Structure formats: C-alpha cells, structure tokens
C-alpha cells in the first residue's frame, strides 16, 4: 500500500500532522505550506495527497482539478440512527456576531465600522459576507467598506489587514493561517470578543464553543452567550440562541480534498485512520485525537465527530451547490474558470 501525505497549513497544524504520523506508524505524513492556497498547490503537484478544506478553498481546489473525498460531520439532531460515517450533513450556519452593549449596530449600518473575518476567500468569514455586501452596495469596493479588519490573507500593509495581531512576536501579522492570532473561526472571534472589531464573521457553533465555559481559553474563560447578538439580514439583532432565524448562510461543511486518482486510497486510509483516532476512536484519547486540538482546529474543526461519506460521488459544484458556487462566481468578478495557479 501507500502512504498518506497530509497537508499542513502553518507550524501548529504541522506538529499536529507530526503527532499524528508518529501514532499512525507512518501510514501518514506530513508536507506542511504557510498558506492554504500553497497546500491546495503541493496536492496538483502531488507533493502532497490532501488536507481539509472550507468550501471556498473546495471552490478554489475544484477549479484545478481537485475533488471532494469526505465531509466534516458534526453532533446532529436528525438521521439519528445512522452511523456517523454514514449521516448525511447539515451544513453549518454562516453568522454576524456582534457585541449586545453595542447598541443600534445592525447589519444595515455595517458600513465604517471593524470587522473580523475568518480569512479571504473562506465561507463564513469571507464570501457570504463581502459577496451579499457587494450585491447591496452595488460595489466592488469590499475592500474600503469597513473601516478596518482583520481579514487574514488581505494585503498586510491595507486596512483589511490593520486590526491582525500576528503571532506572539507580532510577526505573520496577517498571515492566512494559525499563527495570526485572529485567524480562523476562534481567532475571529476573539477579535470580536476582545472588541477588535465590531463584527465578526463566523459560524454559530463558534459562538456555543467559545462561551459559557466551553473554552477554557484566557479570551474566552469569562465570556457570555447573553453578551452576543447576531445580526439577521432585515437588520434585526437576536440573540445567539436564534442562529436558525438569524443567519447569513447555510455553509457546506468544510471537506477533504485530493487528486482524483488518490481520492479512493484517501478515503480508505482516513475510515480506518478516524477508526483509530476519531471521537470514539480506538486509541483516543489514550494516544492521539485527530479531532482535538485544544480549540484551535488544526487539521479539522476540533467539533468534527467523524468524516463522513459523501454519496453521489459529487463533483466539486455538487458538492458546494449551484447557489454557492455562482455567489462565489459573482464575487470574484470583483478581484472566471480558471485555476488561479
Ligand atoms: C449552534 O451551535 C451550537 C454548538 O454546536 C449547537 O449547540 C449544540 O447542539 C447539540 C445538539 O444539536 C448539542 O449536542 C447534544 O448535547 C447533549 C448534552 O450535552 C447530549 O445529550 C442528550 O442528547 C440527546 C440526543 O440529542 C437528547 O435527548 C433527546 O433525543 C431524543 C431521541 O432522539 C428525542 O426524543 C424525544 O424526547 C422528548 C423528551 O421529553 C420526548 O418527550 C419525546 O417523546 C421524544 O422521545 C428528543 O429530541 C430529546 O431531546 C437529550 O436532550 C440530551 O441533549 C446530546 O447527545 C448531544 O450531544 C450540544 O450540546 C450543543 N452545544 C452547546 C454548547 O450548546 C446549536 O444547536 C447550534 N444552533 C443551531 C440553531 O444550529
Ligand atoms: C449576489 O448577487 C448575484 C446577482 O444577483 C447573485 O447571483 C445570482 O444568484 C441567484 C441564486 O443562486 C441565481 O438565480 C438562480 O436560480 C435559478 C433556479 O434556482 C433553483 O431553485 C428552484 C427552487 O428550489 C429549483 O427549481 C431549481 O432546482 C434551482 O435550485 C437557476 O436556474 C434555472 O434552471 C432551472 C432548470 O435547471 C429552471 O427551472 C429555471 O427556469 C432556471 O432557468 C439560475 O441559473 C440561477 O442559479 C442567479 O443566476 C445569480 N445571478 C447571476 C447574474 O449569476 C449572488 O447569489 C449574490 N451573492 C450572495 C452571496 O448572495
Ligand atoms: C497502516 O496501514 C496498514 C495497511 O492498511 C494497516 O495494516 C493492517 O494490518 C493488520 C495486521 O497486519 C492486518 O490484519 C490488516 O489486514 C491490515 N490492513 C488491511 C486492510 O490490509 C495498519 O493497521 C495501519 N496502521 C495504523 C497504525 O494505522
Ligand atoms: O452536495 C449537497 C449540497 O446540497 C446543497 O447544494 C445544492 C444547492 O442548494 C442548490 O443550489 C443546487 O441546485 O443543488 C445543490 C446540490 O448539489 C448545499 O450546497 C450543501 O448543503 C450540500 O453540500
Ligand atoms: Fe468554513
Ligand atoms: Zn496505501
Ligand atoms: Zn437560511
Ligand atoms: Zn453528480
């Protein structure tokens, strides 16, 4: 057989890929890149074999040739008898949170105010927001709505960059990957916790997983459900218990990507690897949890319970959805089928 070449975005998600290889007994191993761009790039030259993706990375990857293996499958309600492996997904809720004690902000008067985005180019963070910002604007001007961001993977020198933090030193300010310490679901957030920014652009399980206890972490220990609003797009505020009523969009869950001819020995390699280090997995949490990652959702998304099989054994736009896709489309008008490499 072959082994797995995991792509790893950034020196966090590389020490985990290396825990990972160690404990797999190298059916695994490790590329790593400083941007989720260069990995989808290590894979089309085969450096690599796959990593995991947010669908505008799967839209990005799809373009070139890449396709989808496995889904990120989280807790459900429905389809409750079925394994994990083969649940159908939901699909996860694109979010604007804001602080409660700021007072008349709506998604009406977004304009002029700070923002914390996730990364360019990512689901939540970026394309639904800046794409039904764009359309209601009428401008492609995304880049001088807000006054300031955080919008990892911008020009660092530009406003969309000017709240980044960077790493512990304060350099990789901006970086699209987790050294910036606004990267990402939990980092945007505690951009937005931290009152960074005003907005932030997220999902709803990011606002559950960071508050009320659920993370230990510093930024987030002390904070409170109650003190967040999310914005709805009739320009309402509710409360983060009403992510169903308030949202911005249905979101694919983020995906395994591969070449096409090593899509099937990925997809065997992981069932087994998940088998063993997944939520219920053989080994963890004695050895090693693929899931884990102390809320810092290397590799997967720390609330993954397995990967799951896809059915239709879908392309790229299938697996996105016309609607995504063609939102997408219409947004990078602004910045056509191509493969951007
Ligand atoms: C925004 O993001 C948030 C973070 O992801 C989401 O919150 C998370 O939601 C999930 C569930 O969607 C929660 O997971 C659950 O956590 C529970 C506690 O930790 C777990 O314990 C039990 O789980 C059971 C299964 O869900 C529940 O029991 C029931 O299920 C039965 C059988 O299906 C049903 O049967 C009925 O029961 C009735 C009871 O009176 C009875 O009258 C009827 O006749 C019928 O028999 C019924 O549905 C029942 O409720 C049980 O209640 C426990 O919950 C559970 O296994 C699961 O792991 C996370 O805890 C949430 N995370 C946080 C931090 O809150 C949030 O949902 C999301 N928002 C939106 C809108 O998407
Ligand atoms: C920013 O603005 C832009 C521009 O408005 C916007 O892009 C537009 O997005 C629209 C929504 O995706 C899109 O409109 C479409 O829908 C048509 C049908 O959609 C269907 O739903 C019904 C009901 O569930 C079902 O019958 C279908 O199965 C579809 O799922 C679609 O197609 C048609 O084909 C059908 C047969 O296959 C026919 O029955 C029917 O006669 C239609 O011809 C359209 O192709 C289209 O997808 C707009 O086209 C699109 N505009 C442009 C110029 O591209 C972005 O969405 C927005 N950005 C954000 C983030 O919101
Ligand atoms: C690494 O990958 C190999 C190949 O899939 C696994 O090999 C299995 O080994 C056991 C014991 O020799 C056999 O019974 C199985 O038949 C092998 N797998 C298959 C399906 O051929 C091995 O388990 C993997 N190791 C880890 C730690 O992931
Ligand atoms: O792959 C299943 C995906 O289903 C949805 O996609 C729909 C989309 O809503 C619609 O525009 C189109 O007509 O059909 C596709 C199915 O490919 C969602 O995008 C996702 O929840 C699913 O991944
Ligand atoms: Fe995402
Ligand atoms: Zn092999
Ligand atoms: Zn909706
Ligand atoms: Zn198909």
Not at 211 to 222: H, I, L, R, V, Y
Not at 243 to 265: G, I, K, M, T
Not at 289 to 301: D, G, P, Q, V
Request: proline residues 3%; contains cysteine.
């Amino acid at each position: 057989y072959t082994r797995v070449v995991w792509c790893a975005v950034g020196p966090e998600e590389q020490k985990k890929c290396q825990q990972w290889s160690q404990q797999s007994g190298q059916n695994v191993t490790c590329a790593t890149a400083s941007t989720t761009d260069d990995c989808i790039v290590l894979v089309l030259k085969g450096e690599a074999d796959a990593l995991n993706l947010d669908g505008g990375y799967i839209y990005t990857a799809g373009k070139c040739g890449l396709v989808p293996v496995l889904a990120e499958n989280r807790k459900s309600s429905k389809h409750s008898s079925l394994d994990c492996v083969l649940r159908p997904t939901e699909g996860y809720l694109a979010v604007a949170v804001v602080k409660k004690a700021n007072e008349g902000l709506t998604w009406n008067s977004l304009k002029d105010k700070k923002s914390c985005h996730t990364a360019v180019d990512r689901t939540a963070g970026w394309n639904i927001p800046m794409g039904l910002i764009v359309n209601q604007t009428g401008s492609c001007a995304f880049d001088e709505f807000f006054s300031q961001s955080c919008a990892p993977g911008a020009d660092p020198k530009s406003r969309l960059c000017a709240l980044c933090a960077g790493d512990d030193q304060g350099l990789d300010k901006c970086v699209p990957n987790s050294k910036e310490k606004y990267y990402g679901y939990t980092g945007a957030f505690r951009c937005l916790a931290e009152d960074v920014g005003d907005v932030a652009f997220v999902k709803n399980d990011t606002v559950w997983e960071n508050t009320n206890g659920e993370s230990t972490a510093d930024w987030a220990k002390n904070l409170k459900r109650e003190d967040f609003r999310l914005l709805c797009l009739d320009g309402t505020r509710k409360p983060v218990t009403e992510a169903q009523s308030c949202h911005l969009a249905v979101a694919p869950n983020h995906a395994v990507v591969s070449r096409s001819d090593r899509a099937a020995h990925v997809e065997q390699v992981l069932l087994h690897q998940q088998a063993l280090f997944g939520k219920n997995g053989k080994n963890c949490p004695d050895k090693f949890c693929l899931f884990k990652s102390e809320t810092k959702n290397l590799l997967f998304n720390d609330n993954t319970e397995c990967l799951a099989k896809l059915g239709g054994r879908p392309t790229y736009e299938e697996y996105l959805g016309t609607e995504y896709v063609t939102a997408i489309a219409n947004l990078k008008k602004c910045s056509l089928e191509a493969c951007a490499f």
